[PDB]
């Protein structure tokens, strides 16, 4: 009853029926099915990043040519957990969709590389670990970049250090269209957990 | 020492690259590597916690203050605090978000962008990934009074739809049905705290409305035209009213401050893709108030 | 009488014979310095608290240090408004003198702790926030602190600094870069860059000439530390 | 006796010379051979040895000689040997190669080409393959002295930055700021040896520098526009600089000679392709100097 104050901490809770860890499981098995835990297995899913991405033709593209554009947006996983965390380990798969209205007098073929992290286009060689495909008899692209890195975490959009790990060069032959798809490889995690940041809405822009 | 073909023939279908949607299940991509058994290690060293930073469980369990109340002896009793906070008073139980603001620019002389901004809790910015949600919300409601300020507060749960305000952009409570001797606060889940010497209090909700999810739409959309998914996606709401006016001497100041932390435990989601009628964008701040943002649209 | 090899701390010698070395016919102890103190070690000086910084709040306050937490931000001009900007270990090495007691070192593993001695009268009220975000000024600028909205700073880590309750807070901001063993010549080490928000407005009686104070100070010193390589240099 | 089909419908993707980059796995190349056991022996009796000559524990366990050094008695004492070698007195520790000497050509009138030429130990030949690297590196200092030539030989290891002149073509290390009573060594890992009767000594280098792996660039680029590589790339340098000055009598001769050799163990590396601006082009040398040399591009 004293002038001064106390902290006497009370979880005190509402509706007391059964314990809840009992009838998660019972309503997911009528309604779903599957039983989402762990956001580290959501970083396995190849979700495309673009729709459209036309690619000059006879030009060794680095992916950080789409990847400084597609980080900020947080259209799939990665980038929309790149929010919640600070650094990251592992390999980035991709998946290319091929989308080109294709012409018979050429013989379409599409390469991958490695350059180490925001290099340009010339400064790099080429006699690498490589992978070509035929988009007239295989449209998908199947590559996977590992972790080869001087460091063993990555931060974020770091300083005037560069090439520190690898990543993917993006050669073809002809102006092809294509579809974009990511996420991380089997051993990509995030960590150093943050508050996130905000949201952005709908943008329906009435007039007054 | 070399005979005839003994195997039947293998049927076929082209599908490259089938389900890759999948957390499970053996991929074919291909490593730009020396060694097909590229194995990192383990996350020993590495990350500087030994807590699995990644499960639902924990990122969903963490705290982020929601409101800032401003309870003054001017405001009646038994009434919630209206403030124009606008919400404030009336904190809707429910893991996605509930509040927005609305960034007005210009692009010609008579035609203009509204962009809406929400907030993010940690809890909230998780469920805008996924569509259906389940998970036994909780509450940290804490008064920051001096020595002292004394009363009574009520914190009272209500099941099911929650009054509100539909306007041109936004929707905001209605606390002209919350007050009086109109909403009598007898038959509710309540609490009432002391500010005599008790400070703190965690109000654990859990998850009680007619259905097995509900949405994660929120606040998204939400105005005079489309507000069927704000009624389907709460189960209701907390209402924090005074039983008893505050007490407090001219030494001391008149104003007190009801801070209100969200988190949500045992959460469960449904589907991997957004309900909203947008992707997920994130909002990024303009550096001048004259510059717009990039919408991401629906094409393919 | 062909292997004079001898080692020092770090320093090793290669000499034809053992130089016909004479000394101290018995080493006899002598006056008491060894009785008054036991010998600090270097990574024992290390863990000693400074004064850092002395941070006074009035309410008032025509100043930035009471502007609330802001509920959204909308644009950076409109940034997150705070108390003060701790880049560390920037500042915790410099100070206290202990940069130079680590000099002719070259890569250190600290972990910095923080402690806020607080001191105001019973009839003021009010609540603060002791964020840290480690590259704050280095990663792009949608995900620094001072961006994001009220429920986004204060889902950073860090503790409640309420005044009634808290006279004393004990944080350990750990270890939080990618590169090992943060250098320290031609250092640009800037790693973890701490907070103070406050999120309540500070509250007193509205009429004046009463000197409603706050008086916060704040104390950092080093754990688990290990300081390894010998040099030549330092920067000043 | 003919039943249906029971097998389920096998999933295809057409990827000819799937993975073709990794040194397992089952390859599908045809052997132009009568029997598909095509199995040659062991390596018995092929090699005159029975070392395994392939390993990098072998490769780069190779010594060469870096540098030939001129110890004089004109040379002041605690400051390195300035030659015009350029490097000499300075070693940097490191795997890759950090000497290059420049061939001058004509074309026209008004236009040269200058070819960048190293030289290559087989701890460089092997590190110019691979993009990162990390090596315990070895040193075997030798003195090629006479009976009557006495002295104090320090050599002591510095951590980081190593100080340099960038130059329009190359890096010269800066014996201006390795002299006096400007840069002491009394903090240093150092050894002194002795030229009375002690010849050899071997200093062998861990590796220390704050990060997992450095680079493999070198000296490949490095002038005044492009040297951020040469930096990250050798956590220090050796210096070998006199205590005691060479005493010497008139008969014998006032100059010696300090061989620098140089292998690596322990030798680790990273992914197996250049680093470089350049393909792998390993230097023929022309018959005569008014011949220039074939240069590979980077087109496809």
């Not at chain 1, 002038?3 to 809770?13: A, D, M, P």
């Not at chain 1, 790990?165 to 579809?179: C, E, K, P, V, W």
């Not at chain 3, 940069?99 to 001191?119: I, P, S, T």
């Not at chain 3, 530390?225 to 000043?236: A, E, F, K, M, W």
């Amino acid at each position: 009853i004293n002038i001064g104050n106390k902290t006497n901490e009370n979880v005190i809770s509402f509706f007391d029926s059964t314990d809840a860890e009992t009838q998660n499981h019972n309503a997911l098995m009528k309604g779903c099915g599957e039983f989402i835990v762990n956001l580290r297995t959501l970083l396995r899913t190849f979700r495309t990043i673009t729709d459209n991405w036309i690619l000059q033709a006879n030009t060794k593209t680095p992916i950080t040519d789409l990847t400084n554009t597609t980080d900020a947006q947080g259209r799939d996983y990665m980038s929309y957990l790149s929010y919640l965390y600070r650094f990251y380990r592992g390999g980035r798969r991709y998946k290319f969709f091929n989308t080109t209205p294709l012409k018979q007098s050429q013989t379409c073929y599409i390469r991958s590389f490695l350059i180490p992290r925001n290099y340009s286009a010339d400064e790099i060689n080429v006699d690498g670990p490589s992978h070509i495909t035929y988009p007239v008899i295989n449209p998908v692209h199947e590559v996977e970049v590992p972790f080869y890195s001087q460091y063993r975490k990555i931060p974020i959009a770091s300083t005037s250090d560069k090439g520190y790990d690898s990543s993917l060069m993006y050669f073809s032959n002809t102006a092809t269209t294509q579809i974009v798809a990511r996420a991380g490889n089997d051993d990509f995690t995030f960590g150093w957990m943050i508050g996130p940041p905000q949201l952005q809405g709908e943008s329906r822009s009435v007039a007054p | 020492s070399k005979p005839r073909n003994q195997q039947q023939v293998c049927p076929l279908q082209n599908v490259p690259a089938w389900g890759y949607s999948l957390y499970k299940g053996i991929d074919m991509s291909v490593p730009l590597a020396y060694d097909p058994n590229n194995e990192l290690g383990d996350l020993k060293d590495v990350f500087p916690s030994a807590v699995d930073e990644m499960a639902i469980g924990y990122v969903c369990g963490n705290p982020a203050v929601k409101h800032v109340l401003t309870w003054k002896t001017t405001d009646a009793i038994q009434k919630p605090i209206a403030n124009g906070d606008d919400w404030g008073g009336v904190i809707p139980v429910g893991m996605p978000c509930y509040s927005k603001s609305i960034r007005t620019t210009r692009i010609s002389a008579t035609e203009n962008r509204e962009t809406e901004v929400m907030d993010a809790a940690p809890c909230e910015y998780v469920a805008n990934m996924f569509s259906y949600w389940r998970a036994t919300m909780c509450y940290r409601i804490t008064v920051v009074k001096t020595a002292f300020h004394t009363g009574r507060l009520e914190i009272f749960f209500e099941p099911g739809v929650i009054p509100v305000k539909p306007t041109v952009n936004n929707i905001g409570p209605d606390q002209d049905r919350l007050t009086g001797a109109v909403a009598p606060s007898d038959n509710n889940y309540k609490y009432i705290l002391d500010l005599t010497n008790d400070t703190e209090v965690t109000i654990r909700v859990p998850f009680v409305s007619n259905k097995m999810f509900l949405k994660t739409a929120g606040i998204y959309g939400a105005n005079s035209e489309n507000n069927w998914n704000f009624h389907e996606s709460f189960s209701g709401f907390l209402c924090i009213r005074p039983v008893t006016k505050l007490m407090a001497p001219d030494t001391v100041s008149d104003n007190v401050s009801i801070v209100v932390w969200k988190w949500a435990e045992d959460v469960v989601v449904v589907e991997p893709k957004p309900l909203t009628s947008g992707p997920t964008q994130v909002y990024r701040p303009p550096p001048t108030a004259s510059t717009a943002v990039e919408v991401l649209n629906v094409e393919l | 009488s062909e292997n004079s090899v001898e080692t020092q701390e770090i320093t090793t010698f290669h000499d034809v014979e053992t130089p016909n070395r004479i000394d101290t016919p018995m080493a006899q102890d002598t006056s008491s310095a060894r009785n008054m103190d036991d010998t600090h070690s270097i990574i024992q000086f290390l863990q000693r608290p400074v004064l850092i910084d002395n941070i006074e709040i009035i309410a008032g306050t025509t100043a930035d240090a009471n502007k609330p937490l802001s509920r959204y931000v909308l644009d950076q001009q409109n940034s997150q408004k705070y108390v003060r900007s701790w880049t560390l270990p920037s500042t915790v090495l410099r100070a206290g003198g202990k940069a130079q007691k680590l000099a002719n070192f070259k890569y250190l593993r600290c972990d910095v702790q923080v402690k806020l001695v607080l001191n105001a009268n019973p009839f003021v009220a009010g609540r603060m926030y002791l964020a840290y975000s480690p590259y704050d000024d280095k990663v792009d600028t949608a995900r620094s602190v001072l961006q994001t909205s009220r429920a986004g700073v204060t889902g950073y880590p860090g503790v409640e600094l309420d005044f009634q309750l808290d006279n004393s807070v004990e944080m350990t901001i750990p270890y939080a870069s990618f590169q090992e063993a943060y250098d320290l010549v031609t250092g640009t080490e800037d790693f973890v860059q701490l907070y103070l928000f406050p999120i309540t407005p500070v509250l007193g009686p509205k009429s004046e000439s009463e000197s409603s104070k706050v008086d916060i100070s704040v104390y950092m010193w080093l754990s688990n530390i290990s300081l390894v390589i010998p040099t030549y240099r330092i920067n000043p």
